[PDB]
Structures are given as structure tokens and as C-alpha cells.
Structure 1
Amino acid sequence: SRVCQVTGKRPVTGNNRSHALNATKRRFLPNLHSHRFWVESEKRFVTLRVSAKGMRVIDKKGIDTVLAELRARGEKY
């Protein structure tokens, strides 16, 4: 599924609206990517299906923390 393994971001439904405001169902879905991440603390690469932001989080908090989560939460990975 199109779920960001870091943020839990998933597709959400909203509307389209024309210039005449005609509503047509639609979905916003996240900017997923799947990415080889180096951990070093395990001498290995791990591919997380990750959103940008998901990346920007990993940048900030730093991988291992994020990996504490997921494992804390049960995410396969």
C-alpha cells in the first residue's frame, strides 16, 4: 500500500472543484519513493518506502531513532 513507513502518511480523499465549483471526488496521495538508506549502526542498507518529509524527518531525527519507531511499532522493514 501507498503508506509512508515513517510518517504513516496515506492517501486522503478530497474534491476537485471547477471554476463553477463542480465537486468531483479525487485523492491526494503521498510523495512516496522507496530508498536505500545506509545505517552503519548495522553495516547494511535498508529500503524504506518513504515520503519526502519522511526523508526530511530521517534527516533530522536521524535513521536509528526512526528505526526504533517501526520496530517499536512492529513495522516489518
Structure 2
Amino acid sequence: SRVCQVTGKGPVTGNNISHAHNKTRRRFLPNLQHHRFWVESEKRFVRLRVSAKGMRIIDKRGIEAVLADLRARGEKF
């Protein structure tokens, strides 16, 4: 489903207030894309569907640290 595999960001819900203040149920989707991340210590790519906030977290913490606790949680890659 549309959850980031790094952050767990799924879709959330809210409203669509008009100028006459009609509220309508919409939904807020994460900016999740597919990205291949190079791991040196495995000599391959892993391809995980992450948000852009997850991309920034990979940039800050390293792919090895995030890929360590993806599998403690028990994700695919």
C-alpha cells in the first residue's frame, strides 16, 4: 500500500474547504517514489518505495543504518 518503507507514512485524511466553506473529504498521500539505493557492504542495489522525507533520512543516517532497522520491523528489503 501507499506507506513509506522508511518512515511508515501512510495516507491521512482531511477536508477541502471551499470559499463558501463547504468541507469535502479528501485524502493526503505521501510523496512516495521508487528508488534504488546502493549498498557498498552488499555490492548491490535495494529498491524500496519511499517518501521524499525517507530519502532525506537515508541522506542523513546512511542506507546501512536505515536498512538495519527496516528488518527489525520486518520489511521486504
Match of 1:47 in 2: 47
Structure 2 distance, partners of 1:62, 1:10, is 22
Where is the helix percentage greater, Structure 1 or Structure 2?
2
Match of 1:32 in 2: 32
Aligned residues between the structures: 77
State the shift of 1:41 in Å: 1.0
- Cα deviation code 1:9-34 (max 9, x no counterpart): 00000000001110000000000101
- Cα deviation code 1:29-73 (max 9, x no counterpart): 000101011011110000010100100000001111000111111
Report % sequence identity: 82
Give the 4+ runs in structure 1 shifted more than 6 A. none
Structure 2 distance, partners of 1:48, 1:40, is 16
Structure 2 distance, partners of 1:4, 1:66, is 12
Unpaired stretches in structure 1, ≥5 consecutive residues: none
* TM-score, normalised relative to structure 1: 0.97
1:57-68 paired onto structure 2 within 5 Å: 57-68=57-68
Match of 1:9 in 2: 9
Unpaired stretches in structure 2, ≥5 consecutive residues: none
* TM-score, normalised relative to structure 2: 0.97
Where is the strand percentage greater, Structure 1 or Structure 2?
2
